[PDB]
């Protein structure tokens, strides 16, 4: 089997992605925040704490006829950015661009933190890091891609996010008219749950590549690129004006300027990030201040390959026995 599933920016900023997805009997369509950084697949639901829910589309278990509650499964999770939810556990059929999923855990919050209340364009997140990662307790549940892996044509997603446009989340193969020249396969350590892999270096604007080891993750559910400092002073170096604001938190830069490109390695690969894709725009509504998208990583404890990143490139998640990771441009 394989799927096909159209993603799409939530906002004018690509500030995340949303994925329609059909869970239940008959079909509720929610749309996801697929994210490989976690491994849960929660939904705001007829369960959610109505003061909490502000525009949301919710999945309504008592309404499936496939829907069945998992006895005692409960679910908490907390994410990098403070944000957080928690509540309990259905299994039902969920589909993605065509590829069913029967049995898959629907985590059906009761609580969600301010942050998913306020954001009305997304109805949940669709984990795609490894299963080791899920929150559900006594008993861990599998992500989508684990329970589909074995039906698929072939043991891999690909993440295919558009700047400023719709892009693609392809699941079972791998398609070859997506992307330019070859894709560059490199390995992937899952001893935290992630997908995660070692970069071979940067180069900033047109200067040299400097050849320099960076482990980091790749994370379709951070928005931004977050390195080490190092790198990240490197970059806005070359931004006449640029500073870091611990008012504002991070590095922000004049709205004047024109942003030089990142180019990051993927062995000896090279994905160029260009210049438009690190502006995020204003700090506040009518401010000259403009938010940068290349960040510190330090205090994160890790360094994250987000949207920024990964919307330069068409990037293959391969969850053969030995998983790998595979850029191509496009």
């Given at each position: 089997?394989?799927?096909?599933?159209?993603?799409?920016?939530?906002?004018?900023?690509?500030?995340?992605?949303?994925?329609?997805?059909?869970?239940?009997?008959?079909?509720?369509?929610?749309?996801?925040?697929?994210?490989?950084?976690?491994?849960?697949?929660?939904?705001?639901?007829?369960?959610?704490?109505?003061?909490?829910?502000?525009?949301?589309?919710?999945?309504?278990?008592?309404?499936?006829?496939?829907?069945?509650?998992?006895?005692?499964?409960?679910?908490?999770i907390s994410y990098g950015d403070g944000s957080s939810s928690?509540?309990?556990?259905?299994?039902?059929?969920?589909?993605?661009?065509?590829?069913?999923?029967?049995?898959?855990?629907?985590?059906?919050?009761?609580?969600v933190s301010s942050s998913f209340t306020?954001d009305?364009?997304?109805?949940?997140?669709?984990?795609?890091?490894?299963?080791?990662?899920?929150?559900?307790?006594?008993?861990?549940?599998?992500?989508?891609?684990?329970?589909?892996?074995?039906?698929?044509?072939?043991?891999?997603?690909?993440?295919?996010?558009?700047?400023?446009?719709?892009?693609?989340?392809?699941?079972?193969?791998?398609?070859?008219?997506?992307?330019?020249?070859?894709?560059?396969?490199?390995?992937?350590?899952?001893?935290?749950?992630?997908?995660?892999?070692?970069?071979?270096?940067?180069?900033?604007?047109?200067?040299?590549?400097?050849?320099?080891?960076?482990?980091?993750?790749?994370?379709?559910?951070?928005?931004?690129?977050?390195?080490?400092?190092?790198?990240?002073?490197?970059?806005?170096?070359?931004?006449?004006?640029?500073?870091?604001?611990?008012?504002?938190?991070?590095?922000?830069?004049?709205?004047?300027?024109?942003?030089?490109?990142?180019?990051?390695?993927?062995?000896?690969?090279?994905?160029?990030?260009?210049?438009?894709?690190?502006?995020?725009?204003?700090?506040?509504?009518?401010?000259?201040?403009?938010?940068?998208?290349?960040?510190?990583?330090?205090?994160?404890?890790?360094?994250?390959?987000?949207?920024?990143?990964?919307?330069?490139?068409?990037?293959?998640?391969?969850?053969?026995?030995?998983?790998?990771?595979?850029?191509?441009?496009?």
């Amino acid at each position: 089997s394989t799927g096909s599933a159209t993603t799409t920016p939530i906002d004018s900023l690509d500030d995340a992605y949303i994925t329609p997805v059909q869970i239940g009997t008959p079909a509720q369509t929610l749309n996801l925040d697929f994210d490989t950084g976690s491994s849960d697949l929660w939904v705001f639901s007829s369960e959610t704490t109505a003061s909490e829910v502000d525009g949301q589309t919710i999945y309504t278990p008592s309404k499936s006829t496939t829907a069945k509650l998992l006895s005692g499964a409960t679910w908490s999770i907390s994410y990098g950015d403070g944000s957080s939810s928690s509540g309990d556990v259905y299994t039902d059929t969920v589909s993605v661009g065509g590829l069913t999923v029967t049995g898959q855990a629907v985590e059906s919050a009761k609580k969600v933190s301010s942050s998913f209340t306020e954001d009305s364009t997304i109805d949940g997140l669709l984990g795609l890091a490894f299963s080791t990662l899920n929150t559900v307790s006594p008993t861990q549940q599998k992500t989508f891609f684990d329970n589909a892996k074995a039906s698929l044509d072939s043991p891999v997603f690909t993440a295919d996010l558009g700047y400023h446009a719709p892009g693609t989340y392809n699941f079972g193969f791998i398609d070859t008219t997506a992307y330019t020249g070859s894709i560059t396969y490199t390995a992937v350590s899952t001893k935290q749950g992630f997908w995660e892999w070692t970069s071979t270096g940067y180069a900033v604007g047109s200067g040299t590549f400097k050849s320099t080891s960076i482990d980091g993750i790749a994370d379709t559910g951070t928005t931004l690129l977050y390195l080490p400092a190092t790198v990240v002073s490197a970059y806005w170096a070359q931004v006449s004006g640029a500073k870091s604001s611990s008012s504002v938190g991070g590095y922000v830069f004049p709205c004047s300027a024109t942003l030089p490109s990142f180019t990051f390695g993927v062995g000896s690969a090279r994905i160029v990030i260009p210049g438009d894709y690190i502006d995020f725009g204003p700090i506040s509504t009518g401010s000259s201040s403009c938010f940068g998208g290349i960040q510190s990583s330090a205090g994160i404890g890790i360094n994250i390959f987000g949207d920024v990143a990964l919307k330069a490139a068409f990037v293959v998640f391969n969850g053969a026995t030995t998983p790998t990771l595979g850029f191509a441009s496009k």
